[PDB]
Amino acid sequence: TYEVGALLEAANQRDTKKVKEILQDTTYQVDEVDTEGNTPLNIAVHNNDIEIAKALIDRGADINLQNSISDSPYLYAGAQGRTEILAYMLKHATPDLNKHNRYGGNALIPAAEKGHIDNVKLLLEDGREDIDFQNDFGYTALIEAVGLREGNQLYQDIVKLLMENGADQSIKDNSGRTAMDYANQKGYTEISKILAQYN
Ligand SMILES: [Cl-]
């Protein structure tokens, strides 16, 4: 007999026990939305409330329901380094790979750009994500990891991980540039050396 919004309010309040209380109601529609198009699951993913997120996924919450800026719980978890939640999603739900973020990207591109190497590994191992996918700018995960970032150890490691998993480094973005082009222009010596070792 809960009113619409009860579960959103419990998620906003980070109230794990209240969430579980509500979910005991078998009639409850778990994917109600707020003014920004967020479901309780999306709120939990933003907050990194892992137990709440697991509870909602077990009750059938849609990991692919996008909010007003095109972020679904899945896309956001991948992009923003919510590793535990992402691992759970990859085991207990089915990602929709025809849904993209506001820039036309997937979960893997932003995970790499943002340095979330554990998320990258997860998506490469059991994600289905195309390593060569491109966003609206023509950027791949490799290009973003090289060209948009600082070229440091973390990004060197992300570049190596991608190449070891068969990333195509010959892909050009919308400006006609490859990952090798960016590393060279920016003076990212260690990345250039890594890239030179692969075809
Ligand atoms: Cl993207």
CATH of the domain at 141: 1.25.40.20
Q: For residue 144, how far is its CA from the centre of ligand 1 (angstroms)?
A: 9
State how far the Cα of 82 lies from the Cα of 156, in Å rounded to an integer: 21
Q: How far is the CA of 61 from the centre of ligand 1 (A)?
A: 24
Residue 80, exposed/middle/buried by CB under 10 A (0-12, 13-18, 19+)? buried
Experimental method: X-ray
CA of 100 to the centre of ligand 1 (A): 8
CA of 104 to the centre of ligand 1 (A): 6
Please count the structural domains in the chain.
1
Q: Is 25 exposed, middle or buried (0-12, 13-18, 19+ CB in 10 A)?
A: middle
Q: CA-CA distance, 5 to 28, in Å (whole number)?
A: 10
DSSP string, 64-118: T---TTS--HHHHHHHTT-HHHHHHHHHHS---TT---TTS--SHHHHHHTT-HH
Q: Are 131 and 165 in contact (CB under 8 A)?
A: yes
Distance 129 CA to ligand 1 centre (A): 13
**Residue 193 domain boundaries:** 1-199
Declared resolution, Å: 1.7
d(CA 154, CA 176): 26
**Residue 136 Cα, ligand 1 centroid: separation in angstroms?**
8
Which tokens belong to 89? Answer: 């999603």
Judge residue 132's burial from the number of C-beta atoms within 10 Å of its C-beta, 0-12 exposed, 13-18 middle, 19 or more buried: middle
Report CA Rg, the chain: 19
